Design a protein around this ligand. Structure first.
Ligand SMILES: Nc1ncnc2c1ncn2[C@@H]1O[C@H](COP(=O)(O)OP(=O)(O)CP(=O)(O)O)[C@@H](O)[C@H]1O
Ligand SMILES: [Ca+2]
Ligand SMILES: [Ca+2]
Ligand SMILES: [Mg+2]
Length: 1010
């Protein structure tokens, strides 16, 4: 079987020896699964190791350090090129920090992608087949499908394998195959063969390809290729890589990194042009170009220092962390940066059926017309026991066991339910439960027909399997279903044309209609009382609607459907079934038979999740296609409304929302919390009206009618048990159907953004202190305290792991107690610009003050005055101002070591400030981030290494410090913590305690300041 689209249906079915009615035998499946194997693709990993490392060096900030590492190599290859431990130390320490951030970024990306692919194994994919063991449709694993078995295909499903369409149950079958073809339109499929043998997949209009979705209709066909033999498995690796639009924060940090790179270039140019006079200094040898090259190395070393080279890697780590944390809560995040968009979400739009409710429906109430006395009527209401899809339960009229065969209206009510279905009941021996095959609404009617048993059948000896479709089969054996007018949300109903297998001479053909109660009743001209029909008056109409309103608004919040019959329908030849808009013109002059009400319990997690969303400034909206009275009743149950709150202006329908003023329709989206009776076209219209008011919308849906709205939203969340049409159009899938995972994703989206601002706060406020150190020494005339190899060491220990370990920060204790941020506001927000300069001005003056301390106040050095330090260049033995001062001490490595040690230590104490924007160290101690504590102890260990081993101080031109000089370093480095505690204090109490830590920090403060 190679060209299946060229052969007809009878030839492709005879190739395997299959009947479309029965299906494939169990022995045939065993033989075919041996010859063809499992129906799956080999589990391949996304990106290799080298290509994952290559994408770490693709940003501007990282590519700048690569250029400077090359400059430091070419400009040092001329001077010294023999020893590799004293000459090329500058290019080595610029690369060593790039590899460190590349390793962490790759390590976290490997963890996020290994966690997501381990979540695809959560629940196995399923496919409805027809096999000979069961005389009905059974749901089996998708990987258990062999080439040649009959497969049932319904709307919303995902095609499990390459399928040659044998018959189309609906009038039209649409398939969304952008995954394979690339077309963004639904394509109509037919049964006739395509004569062209070399036809492209575009012209294969009779084949269903694995991985594609069903946009509309129901059909069935025979599988012709499984596993890697499908058109999607043969090009599984030869596929173009996706590229999505940059989210507002992704482009924010990109434009911020470029604006920062321009400022750094002006700062490094300013370094070269203010040190013009020092070019001809005797220290360089009296040469101008020799002194200009040296101060060019300083400009380059300060560029590497002041640049946040770790910003691209920390964004990668944060996004990979949030993705791995959601996968722990069973949330497959399809787009890595999309977990950030849920942080700034303002509105959460939610599908009702299947998303806010468990979709475990059960018919618990139904009524038919008892009699008519005048214009009004009396009804026969019933109750059904049971809430599971198991066909175990009986019907009670007024709390009395009754048999449905006595009531003629119930016999016709079960006939409409059984025949007007595209669903069935399936028994699972593995789990020992009854499962649904199709939609929960139609399966609830299948389980109802089994309980009623209007044609009393002996069910005492049937198996658990055959008892799932026992009474349903008795109905279908009596009436032959000719064609179905499939359910369309334009008319909100579904009709079926049936002809009795009984001789047609006495009994004619009828149409069995079912759909929305208010829509179907408006099209009913007569009503069925018992076995006779009388014309429908008005008093019957409001009396019937009154029971439907009391059921939806009642204590059970019942989902209601009306059942009708059309006794005099047009024949098939006089019906134009090409357009779906004509179907409502055929479902007129019906005969109202009955109305069923089923219960759909909301999920347990939904009630508390709506409360936490309201606490975090988020507004939850219910956009459902169901009735308004039912939707409002559910909103009061889950907490969207109050049990007594007025919803006259907060609950709207599809019609009411259309018939609104521009001012009224503006205030509606800003105040309405429930939208009922809205088509899939209206749902996306609600979403675009919310985004028109500059609001990040998060749509949650599970069905076909939510797919246009899941794409119009900034981020769409899909339930794991919903259709694949919705899971394809979404950015996050809740594999476990947990609604609490949605609020956990909002907290993770806010926490990711917080860790970025703490990374931005630590590097800007500390690297500007390394710039002030270079410029303040020049404005005072002091000997410069740093050389290019020391500006590159402070870049390694301070901008490396202590900066990346900020992406592991724990969340604030009130992270979810603040309104969502405005995504169009500026990033740094002005008041933080003051906090960056306030801390940076101290970090710079502390470094210059540490070098000036040794020249003046230290005992190990000279007691040089301020005048002799400001004019050290003017010192020779001829000068009477400089007497007794050995002016070779102005080149001593002691002030350079005091400044380098303070710069490292004051930036480690600044990393301890960057755990929260406003929470002090007494509330969030440093051991909340254990990765930051380990990174700081590692950076200090590396600083103590180059200080006290033998050959390293000569490389970095430093000297070992004693305890007396190290105690002075902490005296200047510690007040950077006290300075940020003051800035956090003003932020808490004017712009808006861990005692174990206090007992540890004060013995250090006692020893430092004596
Ligand atoms: N198989 C079916 N046959 C006939 N009518 C159906 C039907 N499924 C749903 N309906 C009716 O169509 C009406 C509107 O269509 P829609 O599909 O949007 O409802 P819904 O079940 O999806 C609720 P939600 O939008 O919250 O998921 C529903 O109120 C329902 O009564
Ligand atoms: Ca840097
Ligand atoms: Ca730094
Ligand atoms: Mg739904």
């Amino acid at each position: 079987m190679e060209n299946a689209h060229t052969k007809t249906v009878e030839e492709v079915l005879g190739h395997f020896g299959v009947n479309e009615s029965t299906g494939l035998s169990l022995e045939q499946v065993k033989k075919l699964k041996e010859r063809w194997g499992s129906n799956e693709l080999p589990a391949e990993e996304g990106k290799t190791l080298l290509e994952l490392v290559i994408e770490q060096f693709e940003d501007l900030l990282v590519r700048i350090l690569l250029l400077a590492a090359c400059i430091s190599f070419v400009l040092a290859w001329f001077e010294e090129g023999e020893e590799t431990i004293t000459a090329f130390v500058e290019p080595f320490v610029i690369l060593l920090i790039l590899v460190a951030n590349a390793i962490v970024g790759v390590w976290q990306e490997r963890n996020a992608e290994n966690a997501i692919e381990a979540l695809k194994e959560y629940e196995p994919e399923m496919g409805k087949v027809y096999r000979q063991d069961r005389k009905s449709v059974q749901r089996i694993k998708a990987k258990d499908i062999v080439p040649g078995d009959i497969v049932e295909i319904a709307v919303g499903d995902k095609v499990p394998a390459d399928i040659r369409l044998t018959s189309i149950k609906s009038t039209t079958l649409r398939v969304d195959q952008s995954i394979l073809t690339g077309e963004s339109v639904s394509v109509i499929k037919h049964t006739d063969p395509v004569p062209d043998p070399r036809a492209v997949n575009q012209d294969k209009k009779n084949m269903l390809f694995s991985g594609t979705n069903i946009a509309a209709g129901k059909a069935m066909g025979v599988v012709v290729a499984t596993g890697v033999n499908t058109e999607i498995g043969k090009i599984r690796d030869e596929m173009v890589a996706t590229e999505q639009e940059r989210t507002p924060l992704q482009q924010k940090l990109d434009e911020f990194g470029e604006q920062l790179s321009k400022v750094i270039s002006l700062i490094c140019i300013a370094v070269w042009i203010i040190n013009i006079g020092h070019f001809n200094d005797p220290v360089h040898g009296g040469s101008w170009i020799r002194g200009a090259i040296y101060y060019f190395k300083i400009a380059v070393a300060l560029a590497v220092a002041a640049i946040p080279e770790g910003l691209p890697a920390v964004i990668t780590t944060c996004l990979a962390l949030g993705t791995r944390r959601m996968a722990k809560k069973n949330a497959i995040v399809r787009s890595l940066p999309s977990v950030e968009t849920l942080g700034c979400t303002s509105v959460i739009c939610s599908d009702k059926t299947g998303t806010l409710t468990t979709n475990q429906m059960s018919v618990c109430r139904m009524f038919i017309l008892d009699r008519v006395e005048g214009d009004t009527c009396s009804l026969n209401e019933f109750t059904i026991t049971g809430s599971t899809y198991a066909p175990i339960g009986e019907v009670h009229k007024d709390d009395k066991p009754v048999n449905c065969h006595q009531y003629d209206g119930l016999v016709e009510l079960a006939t409409i339910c059984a025949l007007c279905n595209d669903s069935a009941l399936d028994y699972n021996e593995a789990k020992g439960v009854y499962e649904k095959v199709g939609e929960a609404t139609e399966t609830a009617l299948t389980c109802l027909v089994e309980k009623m048993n209007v044609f009393d059948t002996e069910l005492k000896g049937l198996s658990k399997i055959e008892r799932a479709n026992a009474c349903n089969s008795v109905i279908k054996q009596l009436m032959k279903k000719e064609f179905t007018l499939e359910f369309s949300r334009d008319r909100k109903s579904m009709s079926v044309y049936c002809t009795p297998n009984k001789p047609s001479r006495t009994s004619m053909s009828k149409m069995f209609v079912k759909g929305a109660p208010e829509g179907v009743i408006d099209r009913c001209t007569h009503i069925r009382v018992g076995s006779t029909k009388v014309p429908m008056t008005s008093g019957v109409k409001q009396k019937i609607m009154s029971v439907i309103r009391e059921w939806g608004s009642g204590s059970d919040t019942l989902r209601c459907l009306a059942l009708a019959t059309h006794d005099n329908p047009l024949r098939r030849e006089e019906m134009h079934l090409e357009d779906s808009a004509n179907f409502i013109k055929y479902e007129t002059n019906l005969t109202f038979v009955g109305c069923v009400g089923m219960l759909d319990p909301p999920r347990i997690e939904v009630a508390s999740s709506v409360k936490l969303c309201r606490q975090a400034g988020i507004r939850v909206i219910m956009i459902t296609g169901d009735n308004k009275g039912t939707a409002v009743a559910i909103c009061r149950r889950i907490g969207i409304f109050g049990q007594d709150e007025d919803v006259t202006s907060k609950a709207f329908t599809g019609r009411e929302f259309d018939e609104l003023n521009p001012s009224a329709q503006r205030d509606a989206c800003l105040n309405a919390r429930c939208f009922a009776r809205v088509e899939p076209s209206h749902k996306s219209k609600i979403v675009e009206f919310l985004q028109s008011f500059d609001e990040i919308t998060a749509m949650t849906g599970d069905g076909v009618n939510d797919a246009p709205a899941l794409k119009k939203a900034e981020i769409g969340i899909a339930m794991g048990s919903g259709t694949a049409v919705a899971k394809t159009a979404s950015e996050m899938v809740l594999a476990d159907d947990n609604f609490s995972t949605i609020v956990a994703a909002v907290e993770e989206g806010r926490a990711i953004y917080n860790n970025m601002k703490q990374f931005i706060r630590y590097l800007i406020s500390s690297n500007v202190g390394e710039v002030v150190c270079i410029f303040l020494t020049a404005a005072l005339g002091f000997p410069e305290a740093l050389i290019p190899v020391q500006l590159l060491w402070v870049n390694l220990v301070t901008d490396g792991l202590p900066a990346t370990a900020l992406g592991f920060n724990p969340p604030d204790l009130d992270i979810m107690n603040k309104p969502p941020r405005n995504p169009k506001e500026p990033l740094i927000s002005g008041w933080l610009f003051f906090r960056y300069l306030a801390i940076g001005c101290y970090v710079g003056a502390a470094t210059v003050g540490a070098a000036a301390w040794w020249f003046i106040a230290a005992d190990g050095g000279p007691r040089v005055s301020f005048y002799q330090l400001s004019h050290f260049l003017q010192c020779k033995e001829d000068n009477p101002d400089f007497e007794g001062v050995d002016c070779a001490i102005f080149e001593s490595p002691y002030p350079m070591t005091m400044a380098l040690s303070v710069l490292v230590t004051i930036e480690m104490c600044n990393a301890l400030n960057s755990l929260s924007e406003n929470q002090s160290l007494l509330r969030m101690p440093p051991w909340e981030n254990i990765w930051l504590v380990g990174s700081i102890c590692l950076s200090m260990s590396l600083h103590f290494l180059i200080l006290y081993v033998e050959p390293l101080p000569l490389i970095f031109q430093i000297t070992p410090l004693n305890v007396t000089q190290w105690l002075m370093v902490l005296k200047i480095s510690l007040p950077v913590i006290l300075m940020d505690e003051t800035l956090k204090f003003v932020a808490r109490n004017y712009l808006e305690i861990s005692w174990p830590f206090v007992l540890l920090i004060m013995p250090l403060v006692i020893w430092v300041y004596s």
